[PDB]
Design an enzyme around this catalytic site. Structure first.
Site, PDB file in Angstrom:
ATOM      1  CG  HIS A 152      -1.825   0.939   1.503  1.00  0.00           C
ATOM      2  ND1 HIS A 152      -1.622   2.068   1.772  1.00  0.00           N
ATOM      3  CD2 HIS A 152      -3.200   0.856   0.984  1.00  0.00           C
ATOM      4  CE1 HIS A 152      -2.904   2.959   1.845  1.00  0.00           C
ATOM      5  NE2 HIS A 152      -3.654   2.370   1.298  1.00  0.00           N
TER       6      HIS A 152
ATOM      7  CG  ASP B 294      -0.356  -3.545   5.526  1.00  0.00           C
ATOM      8  OD1 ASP B 294      -1.256  -3.422   6.032  1.00  0.00           O
ATOM      9  OD2 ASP B 294       0.054  -2.674   4.479  1.00  0.00           O
TER      10      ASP B 294
ATOM     11  CE  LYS C  48      -8.578  -0.622   4.093  1.00  0.00           C
ATOM     12  NZ  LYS C  48      -7.309  -0.831   3.986  1.00  0.00           N
TER      13      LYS C  48
HETATM   14  C1  LIG Z   1      -6.624   0.201   4.022  1.00  0.00           C
HETATM   15  C2  LIG Z   1      -4.927  -0.135   3.900  1.00  0.00           C
HETATM   16  C3  LIG Z   1      -3.766   0.714   4.576  1.00  0.00           C
HETATM   17  C4  LIG Z   1      -4.145   2.145   4.712  1.00  0.00           C
HETATM   18  O1  LIG Z   1      -4.672   2.136   6.057  1.00  0.00           O
HETATM   19  P1  LIG Z   1      -6.203   2.834   6.352  1.00  0.00           P
HETATM   20  O2  LIG Z   1      -6.564   2.093   7.594  1.00  0.00           O
HETATM   21  O3  LIG Z   1      -7.267   2.630   5.340  1.00  0.00           O
HETATM   22  O4  LIG Z   1      -6.227   4.185   6.944  1.00  0.00           O
HETATM   23  C5  LIG Z   1      -2.551   0.130   4.766  1.00  0.00           C
HETATM   24  N1  LIG Z   1      -2.147  -1.030   4.300  1.00  0.00           N
HETATM   25  C6  LIG Z   1      -3.192  -2.149   3.686  1.00  0.00           C
HETATM   26  C7  LIG Z   1      -2.681  -3.332   3.236  1.00  0.00           C
HETATM   27  C8  LIG Z   1      -4.501  -1.557   3.536  1.00  0.00           C
HETATM   28  O5  LIG Z   1      -5.532  -2.415   2.783  1.00  0.00           O
END
Ligand SMILES: *Cc1c(COP(=O)(O)O)cnc(C)c1O
Ligand SMILES: *Cc1c(COP(=O)(O)O)cnc(C)c1O
Lengths: 730, 730
Positions: free
Chosen positions: A223, A316, A355
């Protein structure tokens, strides 16, 4: 029972007296019930109360207690003798004490404190300046807002001068109390509650660990948040690992092979001594545990195959978090790797609680699991990690937003929590069978055949616990994924994904007719259903226990209805009212098939999915002209200019190229624009200038309106402007 | 009238028929009324409706319309002939159309869209994963949370797949629509909505402008967020300006003198060519427009005295925002500097909308006013400024939290908005008179005498518009501020500040008896009133139009009550129940006067307020041993160790020393621990170990429990650990 009611059966009613609270029958979902009261023979009520796995105290009214079988006694809390009136008051006290303990035990620490604090009606002169939302209701627009959200969300909007809820920054009282409960629930060594999205959460991780010029092992699917923080910000040096892509353009995991000790090192050309010397040339390796498109890694095989090469590993996992709570998914969980020696990497997990878990947008957690190397000089302590946290954590966190992170933890905790998720697999597995057996053209991206029988012909309850039905086998006729291995990757079951007609399985080429997913996404939206994302030949729907069969069958009504219409070649006016409305000229007298065919040919003739592959294939990465940290500085200093798309080939970009799909950078900052990229973008750009009301979302590029068509332009390095800038030279 | 009701008088009732909505009398505050309906002779209702400055359409029912005077006609929207029944349906249509336009005109763009979007009941399969808060209500703790905040806050919690509310990141549709209205309302060139607190807002500013090794003109009062982002993060080089402090320890503004072109340059020892060469040696100058303790700068004299020496100027105005809406306060507003030439600095303003304006915690704006230099190479464009924005802005902003920034703009907009603030000056000015005339020992930090008469003997309405009554005169007997000049600084009227007995005015030394402000803060909290902050001999209360006379007199009841008790030497048990409870041993048989005296002597004997001065006095700044960006790296690399407070003098700190008061760094990163500091902190440290239940809030320092007492310890540079670390050397 402070807020909690009481569920009683009609017969039990007349026999108990905590008539202070709200009593109600039993056909309840038991979610607002503090004590359940029934007659001993009403065994199904005692059972319903039981299965929820909630822990609600059941009171069985009897007239012959000596007669209740042991087994039923194993289901109740207390017995109520109907033929005894002397106990009427102790009976009521018992029920009341029970309800109060039930509640005192289900609420997490922070939420419980905040809730109690608000129950005091304190006179706030501290900040927020809106104090109680009372500034808002004094103005007509402020009043619409105040009545729109309600008095509570404002009342509970507090700050630092409200010490009874603790110190969320340096973590004390209820604030830290809750963070530690998160730790116990997630099996980590420290959980940090982040209210700025996993975006800022990563900013905390990298900015704590990575020092300038340190070697960052880079998952190429990362990301924008990781690229910018670890590389462009911390000034790390990436060493990329190519990615698996496929005819559908789906974001896959890392090439089975890219995981080779020997390869990685050579591949670490970057800093020969850093690599060709050290046990762990990498300060950090940042890997995407679960990608947007349903590929989940086996956290167990990664730490084993590359742990020795890195001080820490950041998983992540914004697209997941629940795999630790779904039995068949335990391999994917990195926090359930209990056996970490001093020789293996401190493990870290970043997850967006909003999410696919229970949280308000912008809520995430950082799970720190690194005690196994607590001795080491490489070991990053809390004082250091909280230093970072405090670089991005606001000095005034939104409190109701913190309580959300807290209630999500208790919601995942326990068999009840893990029962909530199971029940979802049963619903989801059934909606898919329905679509498949119903003949939909939109098909769940799942293994066609499994155990000789076909996927939709399995025992749902088996499929809800049997990983065999959710896995990308090595050599797949169906998934198209090329560089994967055994027991390496699985299909995320809470990513209800459907593919559209247009791409051929066996052959892996396009077909003659195809239904762009966008046509479907738009149809859906026009009918009160908001899809999460829809790429070229796939549409995605995000699942959590919030899903209910009615809702699943609600999506399917629309999916069958949109098909009925495409096969009947209805008028494009009718299928997509609004698009036709606005773009009435361009789409005049069109039939859906007219469009489907047209859009379809564009990418077909444009050999689209070929380019998407190379974009993440190492033998096709752009050429690092400038290191990321550097390219930024040049950008910050103004040493740049706007080269148009067409003649920008081989120019050094000062910002990442972020197209959709797949929505990951395609040209990192400092990388010089590649022939591949330029073309993929041109398919997109021309696609914008050809299918109004169907234009792909792009970033890092700008569209200058050139007469009839619009035109992409990117910020590129300008060595001359730079060259002649006397502010920097000496 | 969708949600809006209708205010009618009993007589007008029977004459109109928009009986579709909620009608209600007039003794209304008119904040939920879309149309006002009365009889022409009921002139005070037409007046009440008018004065609110809201713009509600008034309908006057008559029986002789030809008789209504011109003057009254200037107050009404439409006339309703009671004697005509044929117009009954057009009358109703008119009233309904009116209410609908009133509403369509008061609501800001984003709020209006979000509100309408939620009104559709769309089936959401996108993220948040809680989708409608329906995940939450399936679990008992999730349900307590869901019922606590209510269904709407969840329903309106949306993301990117909800395109109808636009794109908040790259700004399109309703998202940018609102941001542009903020610009029109604030008189800036671009407003960026920031949902991570002014903390992250500053990170955006500095991280966009300041390049590595660039010269940052540093206000020594700057919040940690500036130190860290401009210096420790961007790697800028500060050139500090000393600060005015006083016997109360109050955070004042910059030394009138420090503003000298000649001085500043010499003072710019740092990079001789950068300075002793350029027209503008500074990329940015970050100055605190209004500090926590009431001192507001005259933005007009700053830009004039130092603008030419910097490319841009960041006015961190988190403690303000409203001075642009208060007449007497216009000088302080930087956005109301309309005459900016190509020669002067692009002006930027960072304000926490939650602090003293209308917003949820974590909401702030960044006002970009730099078109005057739009030609220049120094000019920072939106593409560059939105790049930074997107480094810290989450990829998933909380939407309800964005609508808050939106409704706050309309709330400040117009005479109605500026009427809301004025009214507040009238209440506040009256509360202080009451306190002063009542004989309180806690006195508002205001000019004793003004215009021959004493402050509380002025015409309140004059004081609400007359700056003479809110200003730190050059040479003050009363404020103690030493290095201020003429018409340089004013007293922020929306910072209700009170000082405590203990410090002498005329003499500027301590007195014999004093009432530590903490005693008062604690008493207050014990009686349902939350103060914002309370230093040594002062207690602060934050104001906004949310205040109502009842609430002001509520604070006063408690302030007079605590006084009655201190003079009667009550038992410490009674005055401070809880503190006595916990610390029953230590404070046994104490009277408040016992404590007051005790605490009082501690700082007295400890010569406290002297040390607080030098800490921000240039001839007493620590010694920069390491530049900030460097000291961080060393910290990040683990080249450090925990030197105890007592023997940490002259050691290089890898983290800032954050005590309270004043809560600003006292030892920046890389600065070597000064003699001053060490002592100030020792007063605090020893005070913690002497007055349990009264310990000052510290940061950057750690307290190891050493037997009976606790002990401070700071992260200091370790050149040896560093020295021997083979990871960096070659
Ligand atoms: C959503 C996303 C982020 C960004 O973070 P937010 O929680 O949406 O602010 C970072 N890494 C991954 C894999 C993501 O899908
Ligand atoms: C509050 C404050 C900040 C920190 O921002 P938050 O809005 O509280 O997150 C930055 N600068 C100043 C002057 C502040 O008072």
């Amino acid at each position: 029972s402070s807020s909690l009611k009481i569920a009683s059966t009609q017969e039990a009613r007349q026999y108990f007296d905590t008539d202070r609270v709200v009593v109600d029958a039993v056909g309840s979902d038991f979610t607002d019930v503090g004590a359940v009261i029934a007659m001993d023979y009403e065994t199904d009520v005692i059972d319903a109360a039981d299965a929820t796995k909630f822990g609600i105290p059941v009171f069985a009214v009897t007239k012959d207690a000596q007669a209740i079988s042991a087994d039923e006694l194993k289901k109740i809390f207390h017995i109520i003798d109907l033929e005894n009136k002397f106990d009427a008051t102790v009976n009521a006290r018992e029920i009341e004490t029970a309800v109060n303990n039930y509640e005192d035990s289900i609420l997490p620490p922070f939420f419980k404190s905040l809730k109690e604090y608000v129950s005091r009606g304190l006179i706030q002169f501290d900040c927020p300046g809106h104090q109680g939302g009372q500034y808002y209701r004094k103005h007509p627009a402020g009043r619409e807002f105040y009545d729109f959200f309600g008095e509570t969300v404002f009342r509970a909007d507090l700050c630092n001068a409200d010490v009874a809820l603790g110190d969320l920054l340096i973590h004390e009282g209820p604030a830290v109390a809750a963070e530690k409960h998160a730790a116990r629930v997630y099996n980590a060594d420290k959980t940090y509650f982040v209210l700025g999205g996993s975006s800022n959460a990563n900013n905390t991780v990298t900015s704590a660990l990575v020092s300038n010029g340190d070697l960052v092992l880079f998952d190429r699917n990362n990301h924008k948040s990781v690229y910018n923080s670890a590389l462009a910000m911390a000034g790390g040096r990436p060493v990329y690992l190519q990615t698996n892509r496929n005819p559908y353009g789906f974001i896959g995991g890392i090439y089975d092979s890219d995981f080779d000790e020997k390869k990685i090192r050579e591949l670490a050309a970057k800093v020969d001594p850093e690599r060709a010397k050290w046990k762990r040339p990498f300060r950090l390796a940042v890997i995407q545990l679960g990608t947007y498109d349903g590929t989940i890694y086996n956290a167990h095989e990664v730490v084993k195959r590359i742990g020795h090469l890195c001080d820490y590993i950041e998983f992540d996992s914004a697209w997941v978090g629940y795999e630790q709570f779904i039995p068949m998914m335990r391999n994917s969980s990195p926090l359930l790797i209990d056996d970490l020696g001093p020789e293996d990497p401190g493990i870290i997990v970043v997850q967006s609680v909003h999410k696919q878990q229970a949280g308000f947008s912008q809520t995430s957690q950082i799970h720190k699991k690194d005690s196994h190397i607590k001795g080491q000089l490489r070991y990053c302590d809390h004082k250091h990690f909280n230093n970072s946290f405090n670089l991005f954590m606001s000095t005034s966190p939104f409190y109701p937003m913190y309580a959300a992170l807290d209630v999500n933890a208790a919601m995942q905790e326990g068999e009840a929590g893990r029962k909530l998720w199971h029940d979802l697999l049963i619903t989801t597995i059934e909606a898919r069978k329905k679509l498949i057996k119903a003949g939909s053209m939109f098909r769940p991206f799942v293994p066609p055949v499994v155990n000789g029988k076909k996927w939709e012909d399995g025992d749902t309850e088996d499929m809800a616990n049997n990983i065999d039905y959710w896995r990308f086998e090595k050599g797949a006729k169906w998934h198209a994924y090329e560089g994967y291995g055994d027991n390496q990757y699985y299909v995320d079951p809470n990513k209800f994904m459907l593919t559209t007609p247009g791409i051929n399985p066996e052959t892996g080429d396009y077909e003659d007719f195809g239904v762009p997913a966008t046509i479907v996404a738009n149809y859906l939206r026009d009918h009160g259903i908001i899809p999460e994302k829809s790429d070229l030949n796939s549409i995605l729907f995000l699942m959590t226990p919030a899903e209910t069969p009615a809702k699943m069958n609600n999506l399917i009504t629309q999916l069958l209805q949109l098909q009925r219409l495409i096969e009947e070649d209805a008028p494009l006016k009718q299928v997509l009212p609004s698009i036709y409305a606005a773009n009435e000229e361009r789409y005049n007298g069109y039939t859906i098939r007219e469009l489907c065919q047209e859009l379809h040919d564009f990418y077909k003739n444009n050999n689209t999915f070929t380019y998407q592959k190379r974009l993440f294939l190492r033998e096709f990465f752009p050429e690092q002209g400038m290191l990321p940290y550097e390219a930024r500085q040049e950008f910050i200093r103004n040493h740049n200019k706007l080269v148009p798309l067409n003649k920008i080939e081989g120019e050094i970009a000062l910002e990442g190229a972020l197209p959709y799909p797949p929505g990951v950078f395609c040209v990192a900052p400092g990388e010089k624009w590649s022939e591949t990229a330029v073309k993929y973008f041109t398919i997109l750009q021309d696609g914008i200038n050809n299918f109004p009301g169907f234009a792909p979302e792009i970033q890092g590029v700008y569209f200058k309106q050139e007469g009839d068509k619009v035109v992409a332009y990117g910020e590129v390095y300008d060595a001359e402007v730079a060259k002649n800038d006397d502010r920097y030279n000496n």
